[PDB]
Design a protein around this nucleic acid. Structure first.
Length: 84
RNA sequence: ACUGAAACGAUUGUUGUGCCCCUGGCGGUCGCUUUCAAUGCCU
């Protein structure tokens, strides 16, 4: 129902390790939706555990109801960010 | 797990070494301490 046109201005340099070739690591020119969804709603809606240990420390929880860092909380909040 | 979690292009290094503000130069030239004067007056 509501739609928000949000324009993002970088106030310091942004890095994502999108691809790697030798000494060079580089960032794709589109911000992925799921990265922005946690940037907007983690701590406010999605939980933000400061620590991890175990399999949970190197396995995503993107769409796993059994884990706290889900993007599915937002399906239930009725919210969806698009990619940038 | 935001293509995620942590993330020093760093460490060391003398703008250095030699160098005469040097050489030449007459404070010089001209200039009368000058001009006038009773050892005097009386015995």
């Amino acid at each position: 129902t509501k739609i928000y046109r949000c324009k993002l201005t970088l106030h310091d340099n942004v890095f994502f390790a999108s691809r790697e070739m030798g000494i060079l690591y580089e960032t794709e020119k589109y911000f992925h939706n799921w990265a922005l969804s946690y940037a907007f709603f983690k701590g406010t809606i999605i939980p933000h555990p400061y620590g991890l240990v175990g399999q949970n420390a190197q396995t995503p929880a993107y769409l796993d109801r059994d884990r706290e860092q889900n993007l599915l909380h937002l399906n239930d909040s009725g919210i969806y960010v698009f990619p940038a």
